[PDB]
Amino acid sequence: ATLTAKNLAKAYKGRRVVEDVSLTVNSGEIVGLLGPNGAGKTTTFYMVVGIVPRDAGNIIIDDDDISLLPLHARARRGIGYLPQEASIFRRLSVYDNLMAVLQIRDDLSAEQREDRANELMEEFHIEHLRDSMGQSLSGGERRRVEIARALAANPKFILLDEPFAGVDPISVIDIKRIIEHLRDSGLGVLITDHNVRETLAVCERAYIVSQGHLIAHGTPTEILQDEHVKRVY
Ligand SMILES: CO[C@@H]1[C@@H](OC(N)=O)[C@@H](O)[C@H](Oc2ccc3c(O)c(NC(=O)[C@]45C[C@H]6C[C@H](C[C@H](C6)C4)C5)c(=O)oc3c2C)OC1(C)C
Numbered sequence: 001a002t003l004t005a006k007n008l009a010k011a012y013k014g015r016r017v018v019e020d021v022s023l024t025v026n027s028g029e030i031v032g033l034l035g036p037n038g039a040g041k042t043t044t045f046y047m048v049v050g051i052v053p054r055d056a057g058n059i060i061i062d063d064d065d066i067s068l069l070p071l072h073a074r075a076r077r078g079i080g081y082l083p084q085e086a087s088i089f090r091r092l093s094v095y096d097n098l099m100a101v102l103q104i105r106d107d108l109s110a111e112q113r114e115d116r117a118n119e120l121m122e123e124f125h126i127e128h129l130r131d132s133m134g135q136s137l138s139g140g141e142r143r144r145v146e147i148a149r150a151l152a153a154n155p156k157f158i159l160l161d162e163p164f165a166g167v168d169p170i171s172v173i174d175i176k177r178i179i180e181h182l183r184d185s186g187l188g189v190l191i192t193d194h195n196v197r198e199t200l201a202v203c204e205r206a207y208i209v210s211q212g213h214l215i216a217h218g219t220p221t222e223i224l225q226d227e228h229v230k231r232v233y
């Protein structure tokens with residue numbers, strides 16, 4: 001499957017925070033949307049996920065233009081999403097966090113939902129936290145729970161907004177292995193970051209944004225032929 005955004009634009013109070021941003025991700029790839037703070041990465045993700053309406057451009061999955069579908073409809077089409085800031089249900093246990101999303105799985109029986117919850121906790125190394133409250137988790141543990149909770153919806157594409165933000169260096173490596181695992185499972189993975197040097201090496205392709213504009217794109221090697229990108233990073 002392929003998820004594509006074509007010439008997205010978004011304005012707030014007449015200011016164009018995103019002017020022209022495109023990107024594409026296929027199943028089995030990690031693709032980066034990378035650039036400085038304020039460049040428009042989260043706004044772009046919001047327009048892809050459907051959390052805000054787009055002012056221009058197109059959002060496409062395969063042969064379906066979904067630019068006008070609401071968040072919930074795109075989610076059923078296979079788009080999953082993880083915000084930068086903590087999104088775990090702090091007052092609920094890890095188990096209940098996963099079961100909360102598994103309740104939308106009309107393709108699974110009550111029993112199967114229970115199975116998947118145990119499966120996800122094994123995969124993401126959080127079984128020992130089954131009954132712990134999200135509040136009591138560390139940044140890295142919290143991130144692993146939130147990612148597993150997103151996968152509970154069985155998405156085709158997972159959009160991770162700065163997944164490494166607010167986690168320790170050991171958890172960064174752990175999250176990087178998780179991302180490789182997701183990719184190997186056939187998901188299309190789209191990640192944002194401002195640390196181009198670090199994140200570029202895990203991307204099959206990336207889209208470098210600055211001030212709401214796409215300024216470079218392609219494989220890391222292609223991107224790093226751009227003198228501006230070389231220098232700044
Ligand atoms: C049918 O409803 C479902 C639930 O399903 C059942 N059957 O209940 C379950 O799916 C679920 O539950 C949630 C989800 C979110 C919250 C939540 O954001 C809380 N607020 C805090 O964390 C904060 C907020 C402010 C003020 C303080 C400090 C800081 C900043 C963090 C508390 C919260 O206190 O409880 C939540 C619950 C229970 O979502 C629901 C509600 C849609």
Ligand SMILES: Nc1ncnc2c1ncn2[C@@H]1O[C@H](COP(=O)(O)OP(=O)(O)O)[C@@H](O)[C@H]1O
Nearest residue numbers: 012013017035036037038039040041042043044
């Ligand atoms: N709801 C909003 N109203 C007005 N301006 C906003 C809103 N959300 C974001 N912005 C602005 O849009 C620009 C891009 O923000 P954002 O997409 O969050 O950038 P990034 O994720 O790349 O840091 C920023 O200048 C930000 O202040």
Ligand SMILES: [Mg+2]
Nearest residue numbers: 041042043084
């Ligand atoms: Mg952001």
